[PDB]
């Protein structure tokens, strides 16, 4: 719950070191993911991170390569990627979402209930 | 080739093991499809796994119902292999991303997932009472061998499988993403090919028919039995020398012998799933207590997970090296192991292995990494498990199959089967609770693997063979 996100401009072929931080409930309850808006564009799903850390999964593209992985302790969750090209000049949210029994994909918008703010890291 | 052995037994060996082969190959993928093909959370990834499991665990008490109360054995397990395979069908069916997409992946998956369990649980306890029946009742040393071999057998496809799994799931391309479609059609295709090599076996096999709807009578004798004794306000002789013997104004003795046996049997079987549980408790915690431990060995880096499969592969060391060897030397002499001190000893084996598990932890522990265990030194607990699982299972295969009346031979390898169930749900509810540390957690699997092996010693003493 009230998920902050920042990050900050890079170059091309540079990599980026986002974060995440929850405050106000419980971070090992939350099902973490990264979706990324490009202007034009709906939404892209980036990474997602369960609650304990164990199952991690990426997008298709995952430019280059990430790496997601969060910190109960303090609630700050990160995402680092590596091979950043001039696509992904995007404003990245974080999506947070509670435990619970459900079908539907964790890669998806549907999925998560608690939106952060965006972060335009540019190339 | 002239001996004890009937060549059927040669068909249905190679079928199980064809069957477990793939079980076990389409369990190992399972969690990972729910959750890098489905896209499913880790929680209701795990719980629909382990409701699978569950669920795998409990049929036995339908296919042993349907078996020795309609349709006998090789008619239970020829129609339970023909859902096992339709369901196997869903499941690959389910796994290609071509055709639908979260909504027809998801329920053909389940609904496979479904008839897998249906089937299993029906051809696990059948199987096993057809193979047994195939001997001659005289022919108690050829069946014992046999039960042996059967182990083996689902030792062998189990081992196979996790050798051959990650060959069949590493860098494919089904559709422009990964194949799960394969790792669900090997496994589907070696269901099949187990229920054509038992099938081709049918003119040689000893099928015996159903004795009626042995089920059926059953429940209504005892609930008979059990209503009849209640004279409250008079009464002179409700049901004397046992709660059975004057359920007999119907229900001849010949079914209230039949209902005997079988409780006895289930009441020595009483503690078995609290045996189940705490013997579970070795392929989580030791892999925790072996990330802790060097595994380089000098030759070949040894991952911590990799040691579980040193549990099947003890085992094929073990079960023609007991059978053939150590319970020989033990006939040598006056001893006599009576298939009921082998289970005894085994459990006894089991503590001590876990007994010695919290010992290495407590040496672990005594780090200060000068005196850092290797991998090795979980060789010893691993071979005492393995040992007192060599000793309890085949035993008690075998106690279930010559201890059952034979209008219910099905029936008895269907509560062992449900001890393990019962079991599996013990190690569920008490896995999340956890609040000790690891060597007093073994300290205490060891002391209650002890005292569920005196309960169960004191049970079998007074135990009745049936005879
Ligand atoms: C009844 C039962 C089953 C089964 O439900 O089909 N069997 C397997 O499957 C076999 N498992 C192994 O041979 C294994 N080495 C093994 C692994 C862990 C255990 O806590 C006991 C046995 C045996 S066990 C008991």
Same mark, same amino acid.
């Given at each position: 719950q009230l998920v902050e996100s920042g990050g900050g401009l890079v170059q091309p072929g540079g990599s980026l070191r986002l974060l995440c931080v929850a405050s106000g409930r419980p971070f090992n309850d939350y099902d973490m993911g990264w979706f990324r808006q490009a202007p034009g564009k709906e939404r892209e799903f980036v990474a997602?991170?369960?609650?304990?850390?164990?199952?991690?999964?990426?997008?298709?593209? *995952?430019?280059?390569?990430?790496?997601?992985?969060?910190?109960?302790?303090?609630?700050? *969750?990160?995402?680092? *990627?590596?091979?950043?090209?001039?696509?992904?000049?995007a404003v990245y949210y974080c999506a947070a979402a509670r435990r619970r029994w459900t079908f539907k994909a964790t890669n998806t918008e549907e999925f998560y209930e608690t939106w952060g703010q965006g972060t335009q890291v540019t190339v | 080739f002239g001996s004890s052995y009937p060549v059927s037994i040669a068909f249905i060996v190679v079928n199980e093991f064809c069957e477990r082969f793939s079980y076990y190959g389409m369990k190992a993928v399972l969690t990972?499809?729910?959750?890098?093909? /489905?896209?499913?959370?880790?929680?209701?990834?795990? $719980?629909?796994?382990?409701?699978?499991?569950?669920?795998?665990?409990?049929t036995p008490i339908l296919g042993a119902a349907i078996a020795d109360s309609w349709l006998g054995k090789f008619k239970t397990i020829i129609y339970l292999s023909l859902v096992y395979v339709l369901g196997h069908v869903f =499941? $690959? /069916?389910?796994?290609?991303?071509?055709?639908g997409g979260k909504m027809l992946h998801t329920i053909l998956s389940l609904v496979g997932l479904s008839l897998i369990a249906l089937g299993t649980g029906g051809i696990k306890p059948c199987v096993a009472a057809f193979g047994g029946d195939q001997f001659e009742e005289e022919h108690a040393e050829a069946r014992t061998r046999y039960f042996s071999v059967f182990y083996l057998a689902i030792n062998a496809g189990s081992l196979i499988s996790t050798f051959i799994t990650p060959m069949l799931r590493g860098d494919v391309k089904c559709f422009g993403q990964d194949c799960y479609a394969l790792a669900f059609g090997v496994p589907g295709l070696l269901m099949?090919?187990?229920?054509?090599?038992?099938?081709?076996?049918?003119?040689?096999?000893?099928?015996?028919?159903?004795?009626?709807?042995?089920?059926?009578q059953v429940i209504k004798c005892i609930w008979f039995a059990l209503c009849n004794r209640f004279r409250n306000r008079s009464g002179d002789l409700p049901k004397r020398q046992h709660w059975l013997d004057w359920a007999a104004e119907k229900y001849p003795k010949h079914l209230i012998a039949d209902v005997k046996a079988l409780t006895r049997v289930l009441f020595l079987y009483i503690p078995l799933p609290?045996?189940?549980?705490?013997?579970?408790?070795?392929?989580?915690?030791?892999?925790?207590?072996?990330? =802790?431990?060097?595994?380089?060995?000098?030759?070949?880096?040894?991952?911590?997970?990799?040691?579980?499969?040193?549990?099947?592969?003890?085992?094929?060391?073990?079960?023609?090296?007991?059978?053939?060897?150590?319970?020989?030397?033990?006939? =040598?002499?006056?001893?006599?192991?009576?298939?009921?001190? =082998?289970?005894?000893?085994?459990?006894?084996?089991?503590?001590?292995?876990?007994?010695?598990?919290?010992?290495?932890?407590?040496?672990?522990?005594?780090?200060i990494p000068v005196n850092?265990?290797?991998?090795?030194?979980? /060789?010893?607990?691993?071979?005492?498990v393995t040992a007192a699982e060599v000793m309890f299972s085949v035993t008690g295969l075998e106690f279930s199959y010559s201890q059952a009346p034979s209008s219910?031979?099905?029936?008895?390898?269907?509560?062992?089967?449900?001890?393990?169930?019962?079991?599996?749900?013990?190690? /569920?509810?008490?896995?999340?609770?956890?609040?000790?540390?690891?060597?007093?957690?073994?300290?205490?699997?060891?002391?209650?693997?002890?005292?569920?092996?005196?309960?169960? $010693?004191?049970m079998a003493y007074y135990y009745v063979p049936l005879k």
């Open positions: 997602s991170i369960s609650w304990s850390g164990r199952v991690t999964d990426y997008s298709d593209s *995952m430019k280059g390569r990430c790496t997601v992985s969060r910190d109960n302790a303090k609630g700050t *969750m990160f995402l680092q *990627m590596s091979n950043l090209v001039p696509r992904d000049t | 990972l499809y729910f959750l890098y093909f /489905l896209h499913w959370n880790e929680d209701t990834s795990t $719980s629909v796994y382990h409701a699978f499991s569950s669920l795998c665990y409990f =499941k $690959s /069916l389910g796994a290609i991303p071509i055709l099949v090919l187990a229920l054509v090599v038992f099938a081709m076996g049918s003119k040689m096999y000893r099928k015996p028919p159903p004795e009626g709807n042995i089920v059926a609290m045996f189940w549980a705490l013997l579970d408790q070795q392929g989580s915690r030791w892999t925790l207590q072996a990330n =802790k431990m060097n595994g380089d060995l000098g030759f070949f880096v040894l991952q911590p997970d990799q040691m579980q499969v040193l549990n099947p592969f003890l085992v094929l060391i073990f079960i023609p090296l007991f059978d053939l060897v150590i319970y020989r030397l033990i006939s =040598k002499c006056r001893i006599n192991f009576s298939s009921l001190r =082998k289970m005894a000893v085994g459990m006894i084996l089991a503590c001590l292995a876990f007994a010695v598990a919290a010992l290495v932890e407590t040496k672990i522990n005594g780090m850092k265990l290797s991998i090795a030194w979980q /060789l010893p607990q691993y071979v005492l219910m031979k099905s029936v008895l390898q269907a509560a062992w089967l449900l001890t393990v169930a019962v079991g599996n749900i013990i190690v /569920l509810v008490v896995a999340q609770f956890s609040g000790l540390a690891q060597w007093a957690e073994f300290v205490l699997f060891s002391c209650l693997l002890l005292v569920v092996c005196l309960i169960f $010693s004191v």
